[PDB]
Design a protein around this ligand. Structure first.
Ligand SMILES: *[C@@H]1O[C@H](CO)[C@@H](O[C@@H]2O[C@H](CO)[C@@H](O)[C@H](O)[C@H]2NC(C)=O)[C@H](O)[C@H]1NC(C)=O
Ligand SMILES: *[C@@H]1O[C@H](CO)[C@@H](O)[C@H](O)[C@H]1NC(C)=O
Lengths: 100, 36
């Protein structure tokens, strides 16, 4: 309505604002985040590790990597085959195979 | 013949239970405020 300036969710978090000059309504989506888990065969076998970026799309991770936006300062080399999209998250550093 | 290969009863049981987190549907607000 002409009077309302911003909106809130059922948990009283902000999810939309009205731009004070154009009066356009904008949605606020949180910037992507999640946990990072590291898969290690064990340091008595190999020093190779895989990194799972939990809850995000591999496209979003690759864009954040390219733009130097991703918070951790280390990078895992992408070979194309090393990047696999799972439901848990984006797994970078492991080659997906069909063999079960 | 039904995707996911559920029995009629299993399909009923899954359709009756409703999940309605106050989030957003992603392919993977759903992450709330540091809560995943
Ligand atoms: C003050 O706010 C008004 C609208 O709230 C601005 O007017 C619009 O400005 C855009 C700028 O791209 C124009 O395209 C629109 O046509 C303007 N609206 C009208 C009705 O003319 C105005 O520009 C703002 N003041 C300043 C200095 O930016
Ligand atoms: C990731 O995003 C692309 C479009 O940017 C989409 O096609 C893809 O399906 C998404 N990932 C998943 C697991 O759906």
């Amino acid at each position: 309505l002409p009077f309302q300036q911003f909106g809130r969710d059922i948990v009283d978090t902000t999810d939309a604002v009205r731009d004070p000059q154009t009066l356009e309504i904008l949605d606020i989506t949180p910037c992507s985040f999640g946990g990072v888990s590291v898969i290690t065969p064990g340091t008595n076998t190999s020093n190779q590790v895989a990194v799972l970026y939990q809850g995000v799309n591999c496209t979003e991770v690759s864009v954040a990597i390219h733009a130097d936006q991703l918070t951790p300062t280390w990078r895992v080399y992408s070979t194309g085959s090393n990047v696999f999209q799972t439901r848990a998250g984006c797994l970078i550093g492991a080659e997906y195979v069909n063999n079960s | 013949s039904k995707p996911s290969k559920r029995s009629p009863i299993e399909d009923l049981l899954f359709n009756k239970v409703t999940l309605a987190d106050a989030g957003f549907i992603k392919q993977y607000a759903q992450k709330f405020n540091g809560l995943t």
